[PDB]
Symmetry: C3
Subunit: 314 residues, 3 copies
């Protein structure tokens, strides 16, 4: 199978700059080279060059609307293209708002795709419920069908068409949800596994249930959108919105090795890796490293070991 790396050095989704340097740190860590050592075919599409939209006034509270909107539209295009060539797309980016384009793109080629959202937050704040204008915290609100019309159209996001419905997404790791975000996920009956459920069930059963929920009836493509802050700050400190009591390094990898086994991984996002937020070079390294392991894992790397077929090592 084919893999296509696509860097999304974008940070306008969050007021904190830095996440744009994420792709670099990741490539710099040996991601592309390491990936190539897998049973996969790796191609690097390079980092997308996003044109800034001058005098990008804020829509009500929403910040950098047109700039985010345009960057995503370009991402959706790119991804939609690789998806058209049946290759698996990997978006290494900055803030999570790029999930808009990554999925909206993926959807154009695979409308029946399921989404497993690993994050500490729901990121489903509609532009009317946000306490800030940060779009990085609103991706899902833009991807949901059940949310269309519930909030005023935003400048730059007219190209977007709700790609999936409430019954096609599953959150994992939630532990920092707003009153509105919470109201919404409950009101729409969106399946989710907060840290409380993971504690109760254990990541083992957790993954078991998410697969039976999403792949119970039909077997469709999987879009894993991984926000590195789905794990505990002790594993991925270098991020804009760290939250205590998260997923462990182990559960993170367990999540990715399962999705690998389903043979249905179609698209992956590795977001929020900000190298400029590590209190120490060890923390940045630490973040980049596990974020790479998550990617490698998704694509076949196993903790029990891996070996090439037809090779008699004895």
């Amino acid at each position: 199978k084919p893999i296509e790396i696509i860097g999304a050095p974008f940070s306008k989704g969050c007021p904190r700059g830095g996440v744009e340097k994420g792709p670099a740190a990741l490539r710099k860590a040996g991601l592309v080279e390491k990936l190539k050592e897998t049973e996969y075919n790796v191609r690097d599409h390079g980092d997308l060059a996003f044109v800034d939209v001058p005098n990008d006034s804020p829509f009500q509270i929403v910040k950098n609307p047109r700039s985010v909107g345009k960057a995503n539209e370009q991402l959706a295009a790119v991804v939609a293209e690789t998806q058209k060539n049946g290759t698996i797309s990997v978006v290494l980016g900055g803030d999570h708002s790029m999930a808009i384009g990554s999925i909206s793109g993926h959807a154009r080629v695979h409308p029946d795709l399921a989404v497993i959202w690993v994050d500490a937050h729901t990121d489903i704040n509609t532009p009317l419920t946000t306490s800030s204008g940060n779009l990085a915290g609103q991706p899902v609100a833009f991807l949901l069908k059940e949310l269309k019309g519930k909030f005023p159209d935003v400048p730059g996001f007219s190209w977007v068409t709700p790609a999936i419905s409430a019954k096609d997404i599953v959150y994992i790791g939630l532990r920092d949800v707003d009153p509105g975000e919470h109201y919404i996920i409950k009101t729409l009956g969106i399946k989710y596994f907060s840290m409380t459920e993971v504690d109760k069930l254990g990541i083992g059963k957790v993954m078991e249930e998410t697969f039976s929920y999403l792949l119970g009836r039909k077997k469709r493509p999987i879009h894993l959108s991984f926000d590195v802050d789905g794990l505990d700050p002790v594993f991925t400190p270098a991020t804009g919105t760290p939250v205590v009591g998260g997923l462990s390094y182990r559960e993170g990898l367990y999540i990715t090795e399962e999705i690998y086994k389903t043979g249905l991984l179609s698209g992956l996002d590795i977001m929020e890796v900000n190298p400029t937020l590590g209190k120490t070079p060890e923390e940045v390294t630490r973040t980049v490293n596990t974020a790479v392991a998550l990617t490698l894992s998704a694509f076949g790397t196993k903790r029990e070991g891996n070996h090439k077929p037809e090779t008699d090592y004895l």
Copy 2:
């Protein structure tokens, strides 16, 4: 439902001073304000003023008997009063010896109360089994019916009447028990989940079993006495007797969100938070913060999120 904060700045239960500053740190952390944002009605009773008993000679080994005794009698009174007004009592204190008064008080109004003791220690040392005279490690010995008469009456504790029996308490997190304390809990058939059981069952099944044990036949009130040292020093370092291999930040909260769901929380204690023991301001902050989260959790705060009823966020 009503909540009544009651500070117990007492430290005579342990030779280390500092736990008296605990209430401050907690209030100072925004506890009262944050609590008020819950579906509850919060009232702050302020910190109790404990009169020191001069020439408080030690009873055999027991230290500051009369001083502890009197402080508790005053606490039992206070608590017994709020309990009389059907409000939920919250004791923010110093050393755990105040559990004597918090429960003995709670009991006067709710004799059928169950007790979930989250701690790294059993704290059931009778004045005859203690290696030290520290009462902070003897609360339960004073609250048990099966332990009455087994040890010599102590000066200042004549007002106390065993509030509950061996079949009404459940320990969670035990991992540092003395030969005597152990002999006792085994001899009296006191249900408990040491860290070994939590490892085996997983906090999920652990909470499951404690509720079926305590609420199996009848549904009675719950008195959660939480020793912040039920968790690992990595989460609550600022405490007098830290012990490695404890409950995780996650398990602590899982414990409190369940007890919240039972709708039976009647009384809560948040003890052993000592701000003077943090090797660094981060450690003290760290302790105070999770101790607050435990409290907020107990009273409804959910990691999956919370939202107000009748509010259409869309």
Copy 3:
């Protein structure tokens, strides 16, 4: 029952020196004294004096073959002797290559022994599959029956006779396996619980399965070979090959308390504790301490507490 401490200050299995200082650190931590406080009879055999084999040229890639070979032959002898006196042997060593002699020795007296290998690595690299010549990573290749003849005889290891077969060993904690090592463990159908299985099952069920696998039909002696790097660097940082996402302090102890309950512990190894690798005195202390706890645990120490029989503490 009798316990016999045997120090194996050997480091030629790994290019990094330091693990030879391990026995010291452990004794220096109070191991022997603390052990004596158990229901066991402790005897210290002292640290073995290993004669260096001059001009010990490398066999192909294998480094210090003759030196390792000779040291092990001496260890096998020693252990085989205490085993003959029905006492339980405890090898406190340096690199894991000493597992060769510890088990080969144990085997001579108990050929039906089962082996529970707690380590982050399989250490089953045959001299033909190693990327380095480090024997510390090849112990099992020398102990397996199914591996005999699969690799060229090594200078100094002619005295060795495969002590156990693929169906007599169980790995726990694996998370850093080589292509060849992996090919081998899969090709030989060797039961193992990688960190992925532990995540899935939970150390509780994990221990459950390993006992039914190894003790299902017959009840034989247990040789627990514990490589401190089976746990996460956060617990045992001071080691030559640390790997993230390992066993927790808790799971390590849970592993040992179960093996204790089986009443079948016959032989134990506590390897890879390198005091010269702790970035800070706290890290070295931290490693030594949990390594001691693992040992004490193996021999009866319980987290729920322990008390002497026939002693009425009241």
